[PDB]
Short mmCIF file of C-alpha atoms and ligand atoms in Angstrom, two decimals:
data_model
loop_
_atom_site.label_atom_id
_atom_site.label_comp_id
_atom_site.label_asym_id
_atom_site.label_seq_id
_atom_site.Cartn_x
_atom_site.Cartn_y
_atom_site.Cartn_z
CA UNK A 1 -0.03 0.06 -0.10
CA UNK A 2 1.14 3.69 -0.70
CA UNK A 3 -1.48 5.61 1.32
CA UNK A 4 -3.16 3.68 4.33
CA UNK A 5 -0.31 3.20 6.91
CA UNK A 6 -0.69 -0.51 7.89
CA UNK A 7 -0.38 -0.63 11.70
CA UNK A 8 -2.18 -4.08 12.02
CA UNK A 9 -3.92 -6.01 9.34
CA UNK A 10 -5.99 -4.10 6.71
CA UNK A 11 -9.35 -4.79 5.13
CA UNK A 12 -8.61 -3.02 1.84
CA UNK A 13 -6.33 -3.64 -1.10
CA UNK A 14 -4.30 -1.10 -3.27
CA UNK A 15 -7.19 -0.84 -5.82
CA UNK A 16 -9.71 -0.01 -3.00
CA UNK A 17 -7.07 2.58 -1.87
CA UNK A 18 -7.22 4.21 -5.34
CA UNK A 19 -10.96 4.24 -5.25
CA UNK A 20 -10.79 6.07 -1.84
CA UNK A 21 -8.38 8.47 -3.25
CA UNK A 22 -10.62 9.33 -6.19
CA UNK A 23 -13.51 9.79 -3.86
CA UNK A 24 -11.37 12.06 -1.76
CA UNK A 25 -10.75 14.07 -4.82
CA UNK A 26 -14.53 14.23 -5.58
CA UNK A 27 -15.42 15.15 -2.00
CA UNK A 28 -12.92 17.98 -1.94
CA UNK A 29 -14.14 19.22 -5.37
CA UNK A 30 -17.85 19.10 -4.16
CA UNK A 31 -16.91 20.91 -0.86
CA UNK A 32 -14.88 23.69 -2.77
CA UNK A 33 -17.92 23.98 -5.23
CA UNK A 34 -20.44 24.25 -2.30
CA UNK A 35 -18.23 27.00 -0.59
CA UNK A 36 -17.92 28.95 -3.98
CA UNK A 37 -21.46 28.55 -5.32
CA UNK A 38 -23.19 31.53 -3.71
CA UNK A 39 -20.41 34.03 -4.83
CA UNK A 40 -20.16 32.35 -8.29
CA UNK A 41 -24.03 32.75 -8.88
CA UNK A 42 -23.93 36.30 -7.54
CA UNK A 43 -21.16 37.33 -9.92
CA UNK A 44 -22.66 35.39 -12.94
CA UNK A 45 -26.09 37.02 -12.47
CA UNK A 46 -24.39 40.50 -12.25
CA UNK A 47 -22.18 39.90 -15.33
CA UNK A 48 -25.17 38.57 -17.46
CA UNK A 49 -27.32 41.50 -16.20
CA UNK A 50 -24.78 44.26 -16.89
CA UNK A 51 -23.90 42.79 -20.20
CA UNK A 52 -27.55 42.69 -21.39
CA UNK A 53 -28.25 46.09 -19.85
CA UNK A 54 -25.33 47.77 -21.77
CA UNK A 55 -26.46 46.14 -25.02
CA UNK A 56 -29.99 47.48 -24.43
CA UNK A 57 -28.46 51.07 -23.73
CA UNK A 58 -26.53 50.91 -27.03
CA UNK A 59 -29.51 49.74 -29.01
CA UNK A 60 -31.86 52.36 -27.35
CA UNK A 61 -29.36 55.12 -28.14
CA UNK A 62 -28.96 54.01 -31.68
CA UNK A 63 -32.73 53.94 -32.00
CA UNK A 64 -33.07 57.53 -30.55
CA UNK A 65 -30.39 58.92 -32.86
CA UNK A 66 -32.18 57.17 -35.93
CA UNK A 67 -35.52 58.51 -34.69
CA UNK A 68 -34.28 62.15 -34.31
CA UNK A 69 -32.73 61.92 -37.79
CA UNK A 70 -36.05 60.61 -39.18
CA UNK A 71 -37.95 63.44 -37.51
CA UNK A 72 -35.80 66.45 -37.94
CA UNK A 73 -33.36 65.70 -40.99
CA UNK A 74 -35.31 63.34 -43.42
CA UNK A 75 -33.09 64.78 -46.17
CA UNK A 76 -30.06 62.95 -44.52
CA UNK A 77 -31.96 59.55 -44.48
CA UNK A 78 -31.42 56.75 -45.31
CA UNK A 79 -27.58 57.45 -45.43
CA UNK A 80 -27.94 58.71 -41.71
CA UNK A 81 -29.21 55.08 -40.73
CA UNK A 82 -26.01 53.46 -42.28
CA UNK A 83 -23.37 55.69 -40.43
CA UNK A 84 -25.35 55.67 -37.14
CA UNK A 85 -25.66 51.94 -37.17
CA UNK A 86 -21.94 51.66 -37.95
CA UNK A 87 -21.01 54.09 -35.24
CA UNK A 88 -23.04 52.23 -32.42
CA UNK A 89 -21.97 48.77 -33.86
CA UNK A 90 -18.34 50.00 -33.25
CA UNK A 91 -19.48 51.33 -29.84
CA UNK A 92 -20.63 47.73 -28.86
CA UNK A 93 -17.58 46.21 -30.32
CA UNK A 94 -15.40 48.41 -28.19
CA UNK A 95 -17.50 47.67 -25.10
CA UNK A 96 -16.99 43.93 -25.57
CA UNK A 97 -13.27 44.27 -25.66
CA UNK A 98 -12.47 44.38 -29.56
CA UNK A 99 -9.68 46.64 -30.75
CA UNK A 100 -11.65 49.81 -31.70
CA UNK A 101 -10.36 53.36 -31.78
CA UNK A 102 -12.89 55.75 -30.27
CA UNK A 103 -11.37 58.88 -31.94
CA UNK A 104 -11.70 56.96 -35.31
CA UNK A 105 -15.35 56.14 -34.65
CA UNK A 106 -16.19 59.77 -34.09
CA UNK A 107 -13.99 61.00 -37.10
CA UNK A 108 -15.61 58.42 -39.49
CA UNK A 109 -18.95 59.33 -38.23
CA UNK A 110 -18.46 63.04 -39.08
CA UNK A 111 -16.58 62.16 -42.24
CA UNK A 112 -19.66 60.26 -43.53
CA UNK A 113 -22.27 62.94 -42.17
CA UNK A 114 -20.63 66.02 -43.85
CA UNK A 115 -21.01 65.10 -47.54
CA UNK A 116 -24.74 64.18 -47.27
CA UNK A 117 -25.38 67.45 -45.23
CA UNK A 118 -23.54 69.38 -48.03
CA UNK A 119 -25.45 67.71 -50.95
CA UNK A 120 -28.95 67.47 -49.49
CA UNK A 121 -29.24 70.45 -47.06
CA UNK A 122 -26.69 73.17 -48.14
CA UNK A 123 -26.28 72.60 -51.98
CA UNK A 124 -29.06 70.49 -53.30
CA UNK A 125 -27.93 69.24 -56.75
CA UNK A 126 -20.71 60.46 -55.80
CA UNK A 127 -17.25 61.14 -57.32
CA UNK A 128 -16.79 64.55 -55.30
CA UNK A 129 -17.53 62.61 -52.10
CA UNK A 130 -13.85 62.35 -50.95
CA UNK A 131 -13.28 66.05 -51.59
CA UNK A 132 -16.02 66.82 -49.13
CA UNK A 133 -14.56 64.23 -46.68
CA UNK A 134 -11.25 65.92 -46.68
CA UNK A 135 -12.84 69.59 -46.51
CA UNK A 136 -14.69 68.33 -43.40
CA UNK A 137 -11.47 68.05 -41.39
CA UNK A 138 -9.24 70.48 -43.37
CA UNK A 139 -11.84 73.33 -42.66
CA UNK A 140 -12.86 72.03 -39.10
CA UNK A 141 -16.60 72.55 -40.22
CA UNK A 142 -17.99 70.78 -37.05
CA UNK A 143 -15.79 72.96 -34.54
CA UNK A 144 -14.96 71.39 -31.23
CA UNK A 145 -17.85 69.04 -31.35
CA UNK A 146 -16.06 66.02 -32.58
CA UNK A 147 -13.36 66.37 -29.78
CA UNK A 148 -16.15 66.99 -27.09
CA UNK A 149 -17.98 63.78 -28.15
CA UNK A 150 -14.56 61.96 -28.49
CA UNK A 151 -13.52 62.62 -24.70
CA UNK A 152 -17.30 62.40 -23.47
CA UNK A 153 -17.64 58.88 -24.95
CA UNK A 154 -14.12 57.53 -24.62
CA UNK A 155 -14.07 58.23 -20.80
CA UNK A 156 -17.33 56.19 -20.25
CA UNK A 157 -16.66 53.39 -22.61
CA UNK A 158 -13.16 52.63 -21.11
CA UNK A 159 -14.52 52.39 -17.63
CA UNK A 160 -17.41 50.10 -18.75
CA UNK A 161 -15.02 47.91 -20.82
CA UNK A 162 -12.81 47.27 -17.88
CA UNK A 163 -15.79 46.86 -15.53
CA UNK A 164 -17.03 44.00 -17.79
CA UNK A 165 -13.51 42.48 -18.07
CA UNK A 166 -13.09 42.50 -14.33
CA UNK A 167 -16.49 40.78 -13.67
CA UNK A 168 -15.52 38.03 -16.18
CA UNK A 169 -12.10 37.51 -14.59
CA UNK A 170 -13.75 37.29 -11.13
CA UNK A 171 -16.07 34.64 -12.59
CA UNK A 172 -12.88 32.90 -13.97
CA UNK A 173 -10.85 32.75 -10.72
CA UNK A 174 -13.86 31.69 -8.66
CA UNK A 175 -14.56 28.84 -11.22
CA UNK A 176 -10.93 27.88 -10.79
CA UNK A 177 -11.07 27.64 -7.02
CA UNK A 178 -13.24 24.49 -6.88
CA UNK A 179 -11.20 23.01 -9.79
CA UNK A 180 -7.76 23.51 -8.06
CA UNK A 181 -5.81 20.32 -8.39
CA UNK A 182 -3.84 19.59 -5.34
CA UNK A 183 -0.48 17.70 -4.60
CA UNK A 184 -0.28 13.98 -4.43
CA UNK A 185 0.94 14.16 -0.64
CA UNK A 186 -2.35 16.08 0.09
CA UNK A 187 -4.41 13.45 -1.91
CA UNK A 188 -2.90 10.80 0.38
CA UNK A 189 -3.40 12.98 3.56
CA UNK A 190 -7.17 13.64 2.63
CA UNK A 191 -7.65 9.78 1.91
CA UNK A 192 -6.11 9.04 5.32
CA UNK A 193 -8.31 11.64 7.12
CA UNK A 194 -11.63 10.70 5.37
CA UNK A 195 -11.45 6.99 4.42
CA UNK A 196 -8.36 5.19 5.82
CA UNK A 197 -10.33 4.57 8.95
CA UNK A 198 -12.58 2.23 6.92
CA UNK A 199 -9.52 0.16 5.95
CA UNK A 200 -8.87 -0.40 9.76
CA UNK A 201 -12.42 -1.66 10.15
CA UNK A 202 -13.92 1.49 11.66
CA UNK A 203 -17.63 2.23 10.64
CA UNK A 204 -18.46 5.78 12.10
CA UNK A 205 -15.18 7.17 13.44
CA UNK A 206 -14.50 10.75 12.32
CA UNK A 207 -11.06 12.54 12.08
CA UNK A 208 -9.90 14.97 14.74
CA UNK A 209 -10.61 18.64 14.36
CA UNK A 210 -6.90 19.50 14.83
CA UNK A 211 -5.79 16.80 12.31
CA UNK A 212 -8.16 18.44 9.69
CA UNK A 213 -6.61 21.81 10.53
CA UNK A 214 -3.07 20.57 9.92
CA UNK A 215 -4.02 18.83 6.70
CA UNK A 216 -5.99 21.80 5.44
CA UNK A 217 -3.29 24.47 6.45
CA UNK A 218 -1.02 21.93 4.72
CA UNK A 219 -2.39 21.78 1.25
CA UNK A 220 -3.98 25.24 1.29
CA UNK A 221 -0.67 27.20 1.97
CA UNK A 222 -0.75 28.56 -1.57
CA UNK A 223 -4.51 29.10 -1.92
CA UNK A 224 -4.49 31.33 1.14
CA UNK A 225 -1.92 33.57 -0.37
CA UNK A 226 -4.74 34.57 -2.87
CA UNK A 227 -6.40 36.45 -0.18
CA UNK A 228 -4.42 39.69 -0.48
CA UNK A 229 -4.90 39.98 -4.14
CA UNK A 230 -8.68 39.08 -3.96
CA UNK A 231 -9.14 41.84 -1.20
CA UNK A 232 -7.30 44.32 -3.55
CA UNK A 233 -9.51 43.18 -6.42
CA UNK A 234 -12.72 44.02 -4.40
CA UNK A 235 -11.43 47.28 -3.06
CA UNK A 236 -10.28 48.30 -6.60
CA UNK A 237 -13.64 47.48 -8.03
CA UNK A 238 -15.27 49.59 -5.32
CA UNK A 239 -12.78 52.45 -6.42
CA UNK A 240 -14.11 51.86 -10.08
CA UNK A 241 -17.89 52.14 -9.43
CA UNK A 242 -17.56 55.53 -7.75
CA UNK A 243 -21.73 57.00 -16.40
CA UNK A 244 -22.26 55.65 -19.78
CA UNK A 245 -26.13 55.72 -20.06
CA UNK A 246 -26.19 59.57 -19.88
CA UNK A 247 -23.49 60.06 -22.55
CA UNK A 248 -24.89 57.65 -25.19
CA UNK A 249 -28.30 59.02 -24.56
CA UNK A 250 -27.28 62.62 -25.00
CA UNK A 251 -25.37 61.96 -28.19
CA UNK A 252 -28.40 62.71 -30.50
CA UNK A 253 -28.77 66.24 -28.84
CA UNK A 254 -25.13 66.82 -29.27
CA UNK A 255 -25.05 65.58 -32.82
CA UNK A 256 -28.15 67.89 -33.68
CA UNK A 257 -26.43 71.00 -32.12
CA UNK A 258 -23.36 70.18 -34.27
CA UNK A 259 -25.42 69.99 -37.39
CA UNK A 260 -27.05 73.51 -36.38
CA UNK A 261 -23.50 74.71 -35.90
CA UNK A 262 -22.32 73.67 -39.27
CA UNK A 263 -25.60 75.01 -40.89
CA UNK A 264 -24.85 78.38 -39.14
CA UNK A 265 -21.81 79.23 -41.45
CA UNK A 266 -23.46 77.74 -44.66
CA UNK A 267 -23.12 81.10 -46.52
CA UNK A 268 -19.24 80.93 -46.56
CA UNK A 269 -19.07 77.09 -46.37
CA UNK A 270 -20.97 76.48 -49.58
CA UNK A 271 -18.93 79.01 -51.54
CA UNK A 272 -15.62 77.95 -50.27
CA UNK A 273 -16.49 74.15 -50.97
CA UNK A 274 -17.85 74.86 -54.45
CA UNK A 275 -14.61 76.68 -55.18
CA UNK A 276 -12.34 73.98 -53.71
CA UNK A 277 -14.18 70.95 -55.13
CA UNK A 278 -31.49 51.75 -12.05
CA UNK A 279 -27.90 50.94 -13.21
CA UNK A 280 -26.14 52.76 -10.27
CA UNK A 281 -28.51 51.01 -7.89
CA UNK A 282 -27.18 47.59 -9.40
CA UNK A 283 -23.67 48.37 -9.09
CA UNK A 284 -24.02 49.66 -5.52
CA UNK A 285 -25.98 46.42 -4.61
CA UNK A 286 -23.35 44.31 -6.27
CA UNK A 287 -20.44 46.10 -4.37
CA UNK A 288 -22.25 45.78 -1.03
CA UNK A 289 -22.89 42.08 -1.68
CA UNK A 290 -19.30 41.48 -2.87
CA UNK A 291 -17.79 43.02 0.19
CA UNK A 292 -19.46 40.18 2.26
CA UNK A 293 -17.07 37.66 0.55
CA UNK A 294 -13.75 39.61 1.04
CA UNK A 295 -12.77 36.82 3.64
CA UNK A 296 -13.46 34.02 0.99
CA UNK A 297 -9.87 32.67 0.52
CA UNK A 298 -8.88 33.15 4.29
CA UNK A 299 -12.22 31.31 5.60
CA UNK A 300 -11.81 28.52 3.03
CA UNK A 301 -9.86 25.83 5.20
CA UNK A 302 -12.27 26.69 8.09
CA UNK A 303 -15.12 25.87 5.79
CA UNK A 304 -13.71 22.63 4.49
CA UNK A 305 -13.14 21.45 8.13
CA UNK A 306 -16.43 22.80 9.54
CA UNK A 307 -18.35 21.18 6.62
CA UNK A 308 -16.42 17.86 6.73
CA UNK A 309 -17.27 15.35 9.39
CA UNK A 310 -14.79 15.88 12.18
CA UNK A 311 -14.58 15.23 15.93
CA UNK A 312 -14.47 18.82 17.21
CA UNK A 313 -13.79 17.53 20.83
CA UNK A 314 -10.49 16.04 19.60
CA UNK A 315 -11.66 12.94 21.69
CA UNK A 316 -12.01 9.31 20.33
CA UNK A 317 -11.04 10.45 16.81
CA UNK A 318 -9.06 9.35 13.79
CA UNK A 319 -5.54 10.92 13.31
CA UNK A 320 -4.88 9.52 9.79
CA UNK A 321 -3.34 6.20 11.10
CA UNK A 322 -4.75 5.13 14.36
CA UNK A 323 -7.83 5.62 16.71
CA UNK A 324 -6.50 7.87 19.50
CA UNK A 325 -8.05 9.15 22.71
CA UNK A 326 -6.51 12.65 22.19
CA UNK A 327 -4.87 14.00 19.27
CA UNK A 328 -1.05 14.86 19.59
CA UNK A 329 -0.39 17.65 17.02
CA UNK A 330 1.20 26.39 -7.25
CA UNK A 331 1.27 26.76 -11.04
CA UNK A 332 -2.67 27.35 -11.39
CA UNK A 333 -2.58 29.39 -8.11
CA UNK A 334 0.19 31.49 -9.76
CA UNK A 335 -1.95 31.99 -12.88
CA UNK A 336 -4.76 33.20 -10.53
CA UNK A 337 -2.40 35.74 -8.77
CA UNK A 338 -0.95 36.80 -12.13
CA UNK A 339 -4.38 37.66 -13.59
CA UNK A 340 -5.54 39.37 -10.17
CA UNK A 341 -2.39 41.57 -10.19
CA UNK A 342 -3.13 42.43 -13.90
CA UNK A 343 -6.70 43.32 -13.46
CA UNK A 344 -5.97 45.30 -10.13
CA UNK A 345 -3.29 47.39 -11.94
CA UNK A 346 -5.94 47.96 -14.60
CA UNK A 347 -8.55 48.89 -12.12
CA UNK A 348 -6.34 51.11 -10.02
CA UNK A 349 -5.29 53.02 -13.14
CA UNK A 350 -8.85 54.03 -14.09
CA UNK A 351 -8.58 55.78 -10.77
CA UNK B 1 -38.86 27.78 -15.53
CA UNK B 2 -41.58 28.89 -18.00
CA UNK B 3 -42.57 32.40 -16.82
CA UNK B 4 -46.03 31.98 -18.14
CA UNK B 5 -48.10 29.41 -16.28
CA UNK B 6 -50.51 28.58 -19.24
CA UNK B 7 -49.56 28.85 -22.93
CA UNK B 8 -46.44 30.26 -24.54
CA UNK B 9 -43.49 30.23 -21.97
CA UNK B 10 -39.76 30.81 -22.04
CA UNK B 11 -36.65 28.91 -21.09
CA UNK B 12 -33.28 30.39 -20.95
CA UNK B 13 -29.68 29.02 -20.87
CA UNK B 14 -26.64 31.31 -20.29
CA UNK B 15 -23.21 30.90 -21.79
CA UNK B 16 -20.58 33.23 -20.49
CA UNK B 17 -17.11 34.14 -21.72
CA UNK B 18 -15.12 33.21 -18.65
CA UNK B 19 -13.27 29.92 -19.35
CA UNK B 20 -10.77 31.62 -20.05
CA UNK B 21 -11.90 35.35 -19.85
CA UNK B 22 -10.20 37.55 -22.37
CA UNK B 23 -7.15 39.41 -20.98
CA UNK B 24 -4.89 42.25 -22.34
CA UNK B 25 -7.10 42.70 -25.38
CA UNK B 26 -7.81 39.01 -26.01
CA UNK B 27 -10.42 38.09 -28.75
CA UNK B 28 -13.77 37.87 -27.21
CA UNK B 29 -15.83 34.61 -27.47
CA UNK B 30 -17.44 33.91 -30.90
CA UNK B 31 -21.00 33.16 -31.10
CA UNK B 32 -24.17 33.79 -28.99
CA UNK B 33 -24.34 34.15 -25.15
CA UNK B 34 -27.99 33.46 -24.48
CA UNK B 35 -30.26 30.45 -25.61
CA UNK B 36 -34.08 30.82 -25.47
CA UNK B 37 -36.66 28.03 -26.34
CA UNK B 38 -40.44 28.37 -26.37
CA UNK B 39 -42.17 25.94 -23.80
CA UNK B 40 -45.72 24.81 -23.39
CA UNK B 41 -47.02 24.11 -19.76
C1 LIG C 1 -37.98 53.47 -32.44
O1 LIG C 1 -38.94 53.85 -31.71
C2 LIG C 1 -40.24 54.08 -32.37
C3 LIG C 1 -41.33 54.47 -31.36
O2 LIG C 1 -42.65 54.77 -32.11
C4 LIG C 1 -40.67 52.72 -33.07
O3 LIG C 1 -41.93 52.95 -33.72
C5 LIG C 1 -39.56 52.24 -33.92
O4 LIG C 1 -39.77 50.92 -34.43
C6 LIG C 1 -38.16 52.16 -33.20
N1 LIG C 1 -37.12 51.79 -34.12
C7 LIG C 1 -36.04 51.10 -33.67
C8 LIG C 1 -35.10 50.71 -34.76
O5 LIG C 1 -36.01 50.47 -32.62
C1 LIG C 2 -16.51 26.27 -14.63
O1 LIG C 2 -15.99 26.29 -16.06
C2 LIG C 2 -16.04 24.79 -16.41
C3 LIG C 2 -15.76 24.61 -17.98
O2 LIG C 2 -16.29 23.34 -18.48
C4 LIG C 2 -17.39 24.29 -16.23
O3 LIG C 2 -17.18 22.93 -16.66
C5 LIG C 2 -17.98 24.44 -14.91
O4 LIG C 2 -19.36 24.07 -14.88
C6 LIG C 2 -17.86 25.96 -14.35
N1 LIG C 2 -18.03 26.11 -12.94
C7 LIG C 2 -19.15 26.21 -12.18
C8 LIG C 2 -18.68 25.91 -10.82
O5 LIG C 2 -20.35 26.33 -12.39
#
């Protein structure tokens, strides 16, 4: 045998020892999953809700911009629908982590918007399109409106993008916790603590509380080190919540005022161009519920021992090898800590 | 569970992008995140 220390005879072979080891693995995984389930479901719920809510906000803002174009500038439709749809598509693509340039979104928006304004509103009556696109930026026809929108939307979209990435990475690490594979020595110690009493012919004897403590503090020496980074993660997320609905929803008013501004100088512009050519409540409740789990990694061995069958009195208990009257007395964790450090730096910088 | 007691109901299935979650500008998950089916109670 390689696990069950044979003091007398034994009622179990090597294959039964392997079966007990696999059942020990399954029991540890089930206990960790039961410890992590409440927090996992909380973060999954909130991640799903925030993702759907941001998509709803983007769709509604695109709808409102399209509706205000339909009502106030019918001469710019249906071209207006194309560039508005492209703009808000790129908005959503940026929110969901794709490589999109915010300044380029706004600049392509105004580049597409100016030629149809000139041809349908200012000078009524395809090849000259690029000359108009160049004149848009060369003559600064929209004034400071493009840079105003650029900063207004970049500031909110970056915090939203990093909020979603932080929620997803929290889900990732919490899913990793209950799937943390342990050392072989810990496998054998857990097998001894939970099952090796059956090999000695005992039916209902439980392991000592102190033996459970030494075993758990033995194989969770790495997992407990995650607690500092998890606390910093929680506090940095709290720093970040203290934004994007208001901006995307006022975009239509800002664009309308920019169109008025360009129409204001039409006299000189046409001649020159003719010559030349409940959310805040949700994030607050989320942070207040997330602060209740700041001790998650430090209380984990206590959970494993308090939810495993143990003799708390340390009397007539199993010490891993014999029935006593009184008890005598990294790689995946490294990846978790790496990702936590990364997301914590990213969080703190948006502050 | 089907939200409506009698007639056309709904059943949802979520699929998050967390195993692994994109980092340092990783490509996001490809395809749909939610699954919805009509149910008759
Ligand atoms: C926008 O809102 C109006 C409200 O009457 C609706 O009729 C229209 O279908 C909506 N358009 C989009 C694209 O959601
Ligand atoms: C963790 O992600 C894995 C991927 O297969 C999945 O199997 C598991 O159900 C997820 N975790 C939880 C605890 O629900």
